[PDB]
Ligand binder design. Structure first.
Ligand SMILES: CO/C1=C\C(C)=C\[C@@H](C)[C@@H](O)[C@H](C)C/C(C)=C/C=C/[C@H](OC)[C@@H]([C@@H](C)[C@@H](O)[C@H](C)[C@@]2(O)C[C@@H](O)[C@H](C)[C@@H](C(C)C)O2)OC1=O
Lengths: 198, 345, 69, 159, 750
């Protein structure tokens, strides 16, 4: 496999470079601390916001097409199930709503900072908090959207056979949506103390 | 995981196939069809089912058990071809491999008719229209297996399945066509099992591996029992006829190859518990069909699995068989064994 | 005759909208010439859009005559 | 060359403008291809639904409109001497709209293929297909909205 | 007086018909002509093919099959079918017509059977004549080939379809090894065949071989693949002689085919002038017996007992109509109408006008309401177009939508008269829907000051720009007043236009979603009051009402209050409402900014109210059910309802932001389209400027009417559908109601 060979070559190159820097006495030259301190926190904040909304939308679309394919497939014989299983698509799109809300909240903290206070403690904390909270919300919404889409596909296929299946698989779908809700809660909690760039 | 990547290409296929499964007749509908009086009443009862008005064009006097079977089979094959024509890639290859099993039976039936010199129209009618390679009607004349292969089988996707049949005599008879069918279908089973293992993903991979193992065991038992009555069977040559992908392989298949008596066959099958009771008592084919229906029902429990297509196709083929049996019993009015149908839904 | 109806409707909407736009340009409307990015010369753009609206009026009357017959 | 306005700052704006159209076009192309396969499959059996079933292709193309809009609006604030804050704002907006449009186009393609294949058999499924396609397109709309929110802050209080 | 059942379903009474068999057919005719009775399936206990009128339904089904076969013959032998007189039966309303007699139906059945026999005989004769003529035509073509075609028994020259010519070529190659001389030509004209009733293109072919066993081998191979083989004299003189044999027998066969075809088309044209009326009569005769099939016939007596679902309003009309039928027949009968009081579920029927029909189609696509349940189609009439307008928000695009809908509304008589397609029947039954959406979109665009993405400076702006400033200098306007109607036009083109419009639209969405939710939730109270479900009021309404008015009603009140306080003038800092909402749950009792005195006390009180109402709503109704195996089902269902309620509270309030999202998207696309299409044309001047202006305006109008008015007005329409089906109906729509499908006669297209 070309991808596996590329991964192995990258690992070997990284190990060789690290050993070369360490053995020669320049091991501290591979400094992640200086990389994080000298990196603009605007980069972290904007990447966090963009990845939050992007991964939330990716998860929403993932669940949407998984559920919609099954809804249309099972609707050929039972068209009555589309309107009743639209709740599954609603539960898939609510994660995109969550990502949009988190993106709005984080973008409210995108203020221009002065040159002297560019990499201050508060600014660096804001950048890290926005980046990681956006990553958390986006990945949680992606995972929740995929799970809710799988559950909704099963619910549509099962309630095509008998309508009593939907009222019992909606519980599992609500359990799935709880994951996205908790992801939003944690993402807000991380950025609660992160003040605007100053 | 299972359903993360399935619905990209096979979500619609799975939904429609499981709706078709929902359309399978239940026990209550089977009983209602059993309580019919005439074939017209059977058609009217089937109208209320998910068959719809498939016999609407058929007149009352034209309504016959053979024609009912023809229309039910035509509807089933139209559904299967529609499902295949909406799928691509691994699913399309899976459907083609499903069709190859009927195609082998079609070529065997055509050759049997060719030596038997039966009526061409009835020979074409009896053939399964799912497995149809373009040179299939050519089979009504071709007899030599070398000429067979070079002029027909290389063209068909059955070419990889014809490897070791050149050893036998060039003249072809009923025994030759039977052994050629067995060898071809064994090679097809090996190729299909390999395709399922490599390309078909979990959980459809394991489910269809189990289903193909059951099919291989079934045909191994059938081949052993059909060759037991014949005295020209070689124990080592029979290994080329018994499939090697089933649960019987390798010990039970070896014992079956060395088996020469019905008690010997039972001792060979003593390795597996499921198949012991099948020969212990009762109708063997009835037990095979019942366990096949049970396996199809178990296959339909798994979601985001393409094995549900195979489970559906076997289930509705059995459903068409049951409809034909009920129609024949009603037309002949011999309802002593009218309730001898196999259903799990 | 569907093309004639489509062109008649489009040309009538042109005669309305472009005439309104040219009137707003001629009066030096804030929303149209009130920014440095917006065109500096008001009357020139007003005359250009007057000519465009006259072209659309010619199209409108021609297509309406075609529809009427 | 200023600490606030590095020489690599325009790279982020330019690459965000490029990505805004690149990823939205990729998603729109996937949607168009899948929906075209579905439409051409169904039109052999039901040619009367040829123009009714083209909606998935239309809704896949709107994603390209969103990407084009973000690319056009990003070019407004592009410049040689632009701050790193503006560059990363542009990159974030472009990435947001691009990834959202890519996901939306993938979903629209898959659901539109399923819907066109299932509406020829069952005409009642056209409404459901349109609903799910709208649910897929509103995701690209949300990406557009996030891109616009980011862009609104691109050149405000920037020095 | 007929009740105007738009707020709730029409009141229904189950009516029992004591129809004797002497007038059973006429009674079924009159009941189907009325079209006000939804008959109950009284005879559902018995299985099929055993019911009272199974044989007579089967006879009419056979006649319908024969008529469908006649229609297939008319279609294959292309003939336009003459439509029947719809006005003869009035195709609707309560008017009664003279129905066909039983002798007329028997004559129809016998004529259909005899004429089917005649038509199948004639069709078989025509098919055999056509197939032999086709064989002779192929033989003529193969005789008409050039001399070089046969130069390269010695051959198997014949005709095969091009679908198999390659397969035949290759299989013959493999049969003959390297001794293949397969020369083939093509028949340019399409060849029609009666075996498959389709046209297949054929290719004449010839193969040269010598061996008798080989020549028979290849002949059988060719014959196997549906190829009509022919014999040729192998000489040019022989070919000429054989072709002279042809075109003379072909003349006789053409004459015979012409005579038979003329006779058969005469018969089919005779059918076409009367087939539609026969089909309508047979369909009505089958429908009346299918309805009569659902009757509890008494063997000892001669009375057909049938139960139907007629609204109480038309009960007197039905009694008068049945009395009129009795007077027409003159047969004396006992009391035929006897109103019943049962515990069944009556159907849900709402009387709709031409204006409310589309909105009720919208509200019934989701699901059918319960009997005497608060109709969701009455508030939809206004809410759905208004939510669409909030998302749409454009006075120019809204004007285009209004004109498009008015074109249908004013010309609705002609469109009703003419046939409509699937996309034309839709958007015409909802022409009033589109009209309301367009009018409300114009209103919202006025409130947004958005006319084709521009702004209207109708009134005096409340913002005053500085007295003087240098070009390119950032200037901030100072407040002088407030804009009377709509958003201020001084906000157009400003850098912080988005920062204001986004907050305005988000708070508008939150407020108009809270109001719409509470309006829908009060419909649950109306339903409970009508149904006398006081325990429902105590256990599901009051807890949920307190929950939403403490968690989300408080948010709306704070949003309104923050607008009514001059924070700059008062000196207090502006409290972030979103941070306040977050802190109301994630850190009770902590407020960074003081919106109003005793904010923390009220916030913790409302949080306690919600956290008390959650167990209230989860437990009180199951507790009442326990203290009046079903207890476990009720308890679990109440848990599911509670969890779904709490989740969809925040879910619905958050998803109402789609109004702001779509409004922003529409505004930005409109502005960007104006920038890329017309704003470019302004710079150019002269003849090229005029031409560019014309072309760019045409492209702008096309793109507008394509994506913004039509398609962006379709996304908002369907999103308002979603907000009504999910965010609004789930509040008060119990659903799972029986749709009203009365036994009415309609024109069934063939
Ligand atoms: C060639 O330019 C056409 C489309 C292009 C290239 C649009 C670009 C701007 C695209 O990049 C954008 C992104 C998408 C867009 C703005 C699609 C609108 C399409 C028009 O639709 C109004 C159809 C429409 C006229 C046509 O598709 C059908 C004939 C039809 O009218 C048939 C009707 O039955 C159906 C109800 C109707 C529906 C589906 C809209 O479409 O024009 C075209 O083809």
């Amino acid at each position: 496999s070309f991808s596996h060979f590329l991964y192995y070559l990258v690992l070997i190159v990284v190990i060789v470079y690290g050993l070369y820097k360490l053995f020669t006495g320049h091991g501290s030259d591979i400094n992640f601390g200086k990389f994080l301190l000298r990196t603009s926190p605007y980069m972290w904040a904007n990447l966090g916001i963009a990845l939050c909304v992007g991964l939330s939308v990716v998860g929403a679309a993932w669940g949407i097409f998984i559920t919609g394919s099954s809804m249309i497939g099972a609707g050929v014989r039972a068209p009555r199930i589309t309107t009743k299983n639209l709740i599954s698509i609603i539960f898939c799109e609510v994660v995109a709503i969550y990502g949009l809300i988190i993106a709005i909240v984080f973008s409210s903290k995108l203020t221009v900072a002065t040159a002297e206070n560019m990499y201050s403690k508060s600014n660096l904390y804001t950048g890290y908090s926005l980046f990681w909270a956006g990553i958390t919300v986006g990945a949680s919404n992606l995972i929740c959207g995929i799970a809710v889409g799988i559950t909704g596909a099963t619910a549509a296929i099962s309630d095509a056979a008998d309508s009593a299946l939907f009222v019992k698989i909606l519980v599992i779908e609500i359990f799935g949506s709880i994951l996205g809700l908790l992801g939003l809660i944690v993402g807000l909690l991380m950025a609660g103390k992160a003040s605007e760039f100053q | 995981m299972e359903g993360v990547y399935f619905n990209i290409d096979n979500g619609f296929i799975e939904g429609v196939v499981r709706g078709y499964r929902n359309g399978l007749l239940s026990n209550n509908q089977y009983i209602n069809l059993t309580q019919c009086d005439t074939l017209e009443d059977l058609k009217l009862q089937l109208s209320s089912t998910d068959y719809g008005n498939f016999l609407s064009s058929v007149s009352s006097e034209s309504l016959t058990t053979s024609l009912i079977q023809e229309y039910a089979s035509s509807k089933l094959y139209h559904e299967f071809n529609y499902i295949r024509d909406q799928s691509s890639g691994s699913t399309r290859k899976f459907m083609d491999y499903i069709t190859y099993g009927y195609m082998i039976d079609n070529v065997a039936l055509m050759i049997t008719g060719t030596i038997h010199d039966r009526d061409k129209g009835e020979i074409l009618q009896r053939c399964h229209p799912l497995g149809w390679f373009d040179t299939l009607p050519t089979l009504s004349v071709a007899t030599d297996l070398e000429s067979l292969y070079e002029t027909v089988l290389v063209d068909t996707p059955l070419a990889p399945y014809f490897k070791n049949c050149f050893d036998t005599a060039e003249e072809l008879d009923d025994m030759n066509i039977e052994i050629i069918r067995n060898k071809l279908y064994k090679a097809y089973l090996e190729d299909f099992y390999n395709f399922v293992t490599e390309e078909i993903p979990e959980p459809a991979k394991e489910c269809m591996q189990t289903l193909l193992g059951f099919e291989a065991d079934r045909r191994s038992i059938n081949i052993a029992l059909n060759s037991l009555q014949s005295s020209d069977i070689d124990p080592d040559l029979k290994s080329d006829l018994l499939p090697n992908i089933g649960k019987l392989y390798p010990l039970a298949t070896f014992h079956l190859a060395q088996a020469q008596d019905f008690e010997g066959v039972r001792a060979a099958l003593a390795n597996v518990y499921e198949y012991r009771g099948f020969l212990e008592t009762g109708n063997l084919e009835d037990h095979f069909y019942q366990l096949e229906m049970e396996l199809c029902r178990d296959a339909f429990t798994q979601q985001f699995a393409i094995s549900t297509v195979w489970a559906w196709m076997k289930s509705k083929e059995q459903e068409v068989r049951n409809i034909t049996w009920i129609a024949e019993c009603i037309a002949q009015n011999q309802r002593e064994r009218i309730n001898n149908y196999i259903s799990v839904y | 005759t569907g093309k004639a109806w489509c062109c008649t409707v489009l040309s009538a909407f042109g005669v309305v909208i472009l005439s309104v736009i040219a009137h707003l340009f001629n009066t030096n409307h804030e929303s149209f010439v009130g920014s440095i990015n917006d065109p500096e010369d008001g009357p020139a753009v007003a005359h250009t859009v007057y000519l465009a609206a006259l072209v659309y009026l010619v199209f409108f009357v021609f297509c309406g005559f075609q529809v009427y017959l | 060359m200023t600490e606030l306005c590095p020489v690599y700052a325009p790279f982020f704006g330019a690459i965000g403008c490029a990505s805004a159209i690149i990823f939205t076009s990729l998603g729109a192309a996937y949607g168009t291809a899948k929906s075209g396969v579905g439409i051409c499959a169904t039109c052999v059996l039901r040619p009367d639904l040829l123009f009714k079933n083209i909606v998935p292709v239309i809704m896949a193309g709107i994603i390209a409109i969103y990407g084009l809009v973000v690319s056009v609006l990003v070019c407004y604030s592009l410049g040689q001497k632009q701050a790193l804050y503006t560059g990363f704002i542009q990159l974030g907006a472009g990435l947001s709209v691009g990834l959202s449009g890519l996901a939306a186009g993938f979903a629209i393609g898959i659901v539109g293929d399923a819907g066109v294949r299932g509406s020829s058999q069952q005409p009642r499924l056209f409404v459901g297909m349109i609903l799910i396609l709208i649910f897929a397109e509103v995701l690209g709309l949300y990406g557009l909205i996030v891109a616009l929110l980011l862009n609104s802050r691109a050149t405000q209080d920037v020095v | 007086e007929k009740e105007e059942a738009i707020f709730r379903s029409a009141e229904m009474a189950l009516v029992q018909f004591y129809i004797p068999q002497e007038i059973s057919r006429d009674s079924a005719y009159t009941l189907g002509q009325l079209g006000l009775v939804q008959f109950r399936d009284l005879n559902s206990k018995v299985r099929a093919f055993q019911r009272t009128f199974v044989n007579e339904i089967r006879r009419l089904d056979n006649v319908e099959r024969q008529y469908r076969y006649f229609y297939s013959l008319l279609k294959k032998h292309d003939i336009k079918l003459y439509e029947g007189d719809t006005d003869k039966y009035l195709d609707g309303s309560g008017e009664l017509y003279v129905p066909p007699s039983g002798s007329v139906i028997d004559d129809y059945v016998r004529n259909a059977s005899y004429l089917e026999e005649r038509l199948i005989q004639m069709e078989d004769a025509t098919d055999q004549i056509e197939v032999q003529k086709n064989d002779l035509e192929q033989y003529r073509f193969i005789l008409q080939s050039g001399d070089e075609f046969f130069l390269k028994v010695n051959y198997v020259t014949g005709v095969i379809a091009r679908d198999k010519v390659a397969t035949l070529e290759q299989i013959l190659w493999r049969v003959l090894r390297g001794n293949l001389f397969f020369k083939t030509v093509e028949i340019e004209q399409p060849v029609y065949d009666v075996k498959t009733r389709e046209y297949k293109h054929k290719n004449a072919f010839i193969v040269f071989s010598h061996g008798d066993l080989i020549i028979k081998r290849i002949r059988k191979i060719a014959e196997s693949l549906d190829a009509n083989l022919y014999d040729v004299d192998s000489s040019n003189e022989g070919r000429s002689q054989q072709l002279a044999k042809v075109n003379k027998n072909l003349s006789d066969l053409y004459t015979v085919l012409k005579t038979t075809s003329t006779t058969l088309e005469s018969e089919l044209y005779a059918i076409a002038k009367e087939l539609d009326s026969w089909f309508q009569d047979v369909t009505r005769e089958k429908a009346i017996f299918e309805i009569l099939n659902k009757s509890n016939y008494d063997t000892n007596r001669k009375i057909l007992i049938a139960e139907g679902w007629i609204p109480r309003d038309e009960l007197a009309t039905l009694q008068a109509r049945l009395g009129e039928m009795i007077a027409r027949l003159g047969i004396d009968v006992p009391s035929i109408i006897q109103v019943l009081d049962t515990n069944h579920t009556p159907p849900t029927f709402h009387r709709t006008n031409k204006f409310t029909a589309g909105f009720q189609s919208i509200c019934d696509c989701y699901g059918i309401a319960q009997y005497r349940e608060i109709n969701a189609g009455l508030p939809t009439i206004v809410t759905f177009p208004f939510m669409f307008a909030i998302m749409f928000g454009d006075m120019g695009h809204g004007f285009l939508m209004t004109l498009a809908a008015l074109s249908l509304v004013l010309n609705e008589k002609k469109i009703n008269k003419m046939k409509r397609g699937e996309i034309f029947d839709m958007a015409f039954t909802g022409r009033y829907i589109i009209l309301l959406m367009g009018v409300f979109s114009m209103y919202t665009g006025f409130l947004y000051n958005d006319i084709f993405s521009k702004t209207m400076t109708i009134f005096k702006s409340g913002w005053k720009w500085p007295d003087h400033w240098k070009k390119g200098e950032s200037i901030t306007a100072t407040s002088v007043g407030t804009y009377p109607i709509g958003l201020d036009w001084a906000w157009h083109g400003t850098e912080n236009a988005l920062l204001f419009s986004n907050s305005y639209k988000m708070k508008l969405s939150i407020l108009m979603g809270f109001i719409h939710m509470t309006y829908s939730y009060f419909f649950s109270l109306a339903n409970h009051l009508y149904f006398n479900s006081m325990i429902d009021i105590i256990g599901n309404f009051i807890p949920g009402l307190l929950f939403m008015q403490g968690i989300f009603g408080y948010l709306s009140v704070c949003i309104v209050y923050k607008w009514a306080v001059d924070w700059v003038k008062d000196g207090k800092p502006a409290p972030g409402l979103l941070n306040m909402l977050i802190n109301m749950f994630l850190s009770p009792g902590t407020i960074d900014d003081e919106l109003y005195p005793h904010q923390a006390k009220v916030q913790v009180f409302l949080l306690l109210m919600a956290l008390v109402c959650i167990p209230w709503l989860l437990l009180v109704k199951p507790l009442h059910f326990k203290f009046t195996e079903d207890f476990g089902d009720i308890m679990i269902h109440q848990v599911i309802h509670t969890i779904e309620f709490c989740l969809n509270c925040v879910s619905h309030t958050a998803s109402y932001l789609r109004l702001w999202a779509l409004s922003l998207a529409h505004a930005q696309l409109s502005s960007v389209l104006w920038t890329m299409t017309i704003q470019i044309a302004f710079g150019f001047r002269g003849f090229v400027g005029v031409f560019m202006t014309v072309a760019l305006f045409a492209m702008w109008f096309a793109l507008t009417c394509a994506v913004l008015v039509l398609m962006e007005g379709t996304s908002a329409m369907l999103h308002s559908l979603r907000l009504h089906w999910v965010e609004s109906m789930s509040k008060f729509f119990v659903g799972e109601g029986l749709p009203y499908e009365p036994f009415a006669f309609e024109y069934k297209d063939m």
